[PDB]
Amino acid sequence: DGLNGTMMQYYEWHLENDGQHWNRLHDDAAALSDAGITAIWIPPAYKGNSQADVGYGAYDLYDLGEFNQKGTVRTKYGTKAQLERAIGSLKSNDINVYGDVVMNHKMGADFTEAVQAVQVNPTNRWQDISGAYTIDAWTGFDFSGRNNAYSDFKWRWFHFNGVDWDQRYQENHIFRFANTNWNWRVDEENGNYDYLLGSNIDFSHPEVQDELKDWGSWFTDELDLDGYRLDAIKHIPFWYTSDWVRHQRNEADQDLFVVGEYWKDDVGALEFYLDEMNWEMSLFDVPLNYNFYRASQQGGSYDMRNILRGSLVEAHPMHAVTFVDNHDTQPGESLESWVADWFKPLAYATILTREGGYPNVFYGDYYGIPNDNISAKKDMIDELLDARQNYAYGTQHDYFDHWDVVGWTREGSSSRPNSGLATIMSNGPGGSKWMYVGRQNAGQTWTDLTGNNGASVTINGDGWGEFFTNGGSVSVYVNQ
């Protein structure tokens, strides 16, 4: 009934490869809903390069842990039946399901093929650095164990335009297939960032365009998805992602939420992409991720008044999926920009108690990351989810007027009893700030849901209250 939406990435990079994750998800459904989670982003659910693959080394998009391929039947997360069972549990508990979609490349080809290719400048793929010669690339996919179930489409080298490994001479190089063009338009870092890893798909081919559109529809129907999380889209021709998304919404009866991962610490680049998409999807707020990271790294000297500056949520709140960390930013991973424990509570309060943006909770933060001795922050997050789910409603007032202490308020809405809140925090010494929470809340006494400050704040006759916060901390006051 108008409840704020909250997404949760249900996995972390170092999850154990025990094949019991879908089952865990299934048993956690009710608890997650009660906690305030309304949507779950599941990891790539199809067969990857190997059983332990996190899912991005995608081998067979039609094998959801159902066929014996790549050395295993189940994926790292479990079997097809356990996933379907988990999804059913999510639906019955009012939780939307977003499926991760990996279409930029394929990995784990069954055999190599001889291909004329040229080496290109890694920092400028538009420039060849060698003449054309024949290499042996891993491009042949037969999906043997699937027996053509669902689809008899087979992949070959002519469906791709590049790889980063030559099996003939056993060397690593960024290869562009001779007589093939890099996809366009794509991100321009390194000149043309079409190629990332694995066997890079060339969408110029109509057969490729149709195959992935048809697979998408099949995947959507098979799992009854409510949306998707589009992987590495800055490496995929923009025109195609738009075509694909429009195609899926046309084939599915249910609404489909779409959030793309355009990984770049540049809001303008993201806005450019959204213009190209005619704003038909949201994008993860990568700049905000880096804002949080810069703050975490610098300490109190960071000017909190700029915490949201340059972020996507700041400019287009309706098209931004906000987050603090993910499987790519956690320690040791490729896009590391981990927010330390001290600043993490402030970052989560920022995405969970504000009116703009569609916030996402990271599994690694919620349950911790054992591999790196990172504690579970479930207690802290649940209090902020309680705030979001039951109190973050109504007109918002911002107070980013001090370099250390900042905050904002929500007047609450008649639709939700006792809703309304006041968030105040400091990345340096503690302090206080008078903020307006709505004259309709006069006479109420508000207390901190996080327990970080025992102050009791009574709202005066004009609807103003003075809220307190300790140093390097965050408090969220509500009429509890």
**Which active-site residues does the annotation give?**
231, 261
Q: Give the H/E segment covering residue 264.
A: none
Nearer to Na ion, 206 or 454 (CB): 206
Among the listed residues 76, 80, 235, 410, the single contact to Na ion using CB under 5 A: 235
Query: Rule CB under 5 A: is residue 339 a binding residue for Na ion?
Result: yes
> Smallest distance, Å, CB 193 to Na ion?
8
> Smallest distance, Å, CB 227 to Na ion?
22
- Which residue stretch of 7-15, 19-27, 136-144, 289-297 sits at the interface with Na ion (rule: CB under 5 A)? 289-297
- Scanning residues 81 to 120, which ones bind Na ion (CB under 5 A)? 104
Residues for the chain: how many in total? 480
> Smallest distance, Å, CB 400 to Na ion?
11
Contact present, 450 and 345 (Cβ < 8 Å): yes
Nearer to Na ion, 74 or 234 (CB): 234
Query: Rule CB under 5 A: is residue 400 a binding residue for Na ion?
Result: no
Nearest to residue 229, comparing CAs of 272, 261, 273?
A: 261
Q: How far apart are CA 190 and CA 126, in angstroms?
A: 9
Size of the site for Na ion (CB under 5 A): 15
Is 14 marked as a binding-site residue?
A: no
3-class DSSP assignment, residue 96: strand
- Which residue stretch of 89-97, 358-366, 426-434, 461-469 sits at the interface with Na ion (rule: CB under 5 A)? 426-434
Nearer to Na ion, 105 or 319 (CB): 105
Query: Rule CB under 5 A: is residue 325 a binding residue for Na ion?
Result: yes
Nearer to Na ion, 343 or 391 (CB): 343
- Which residue stretch of 187-195, 384-392, 409-417, 454-462 sits at the interface with Na ion (rule: CB under 5 A)? 187-195
Alpha-carbon Rg for the chain in angstroms: 24
Query: Rule CB under 5 A: is residue 404 a binding residue for Na ion?
Result: yes
Other C-beta atoms closer than 10 Å to the C-beta of 243 total 15
With tokens 């000149």, the residue in question is: 191
Query: Rule CB under 5 A: is residue 329 a binding residue for Na ion?
Result: yes
Structure tokens at 396: 């918002």
Q: How far apart are CA 392 and CA 385, in angstroms?
A: 9
Is 214 marked as a binding-site residue?
A: no
Structure tokens at 376: 């579970």
Q: What is the DSSP letter of 372?
A: G
Nearer to Na ion, 7 or 64 (CB): 7
> Smallest distance, Å, CB 303 to Na ion?
6
Nearest to residue 8, comparing CAs of 317, 326, 261, 319?
A: 326
Is 104 marked as a binding-site residue?
A: yes
Among the listed residues 403, 460, 466, 480, the single contact to Na ion using CB under 5 A: 403
Nearer to Na ion, 93 or 311 (CB): 311
> Smallest distance, Å, CB 362 to Na ion?
9
Is 300 marked as a binding-site residue?
A: yes
Q: How far apart are CA 298 and CA 286, in angstroms?
A: 18
Query: Rule CB under 5 A: is residue 469 a binding residue for Na ion?
Result: no
In this structure, which long-range contacts are made by residues 329-333, counting pairs with CB atoms below 8 Å and at least 24 apart in sequence? 329/289, 329/293, 330/12, 330/13, 330/14, 330/364, 330/369, 330/372, 330/374, 331/369, 331/372, 331/374, 332/372, 333/13
Find all residues with CB under 8 Å of 265, minimum gap 6, and list them.
286, 287, 289, 290
CA geometry: angle at 322 spanning 276 and 11, to 5°? Answer: 105
> Smallest distance, Å, CB 195 to Na ion?
6
Nearer to Na ion, 339 or 459 (CB): 339
Q: Which residues are annotated as a binding site?
A: 104, 194, 202, 235, 300, 404
Q: Which residues are annotated as a binding site for Ca(2+)?
A: 104, 194, 202, 235, 300, 404
For Na ion, the binding residues (CB under 5 A) are 104, 194, 200, 235, 289, 293, 300, 325, 329, 337, 339, 403-404, 427-428
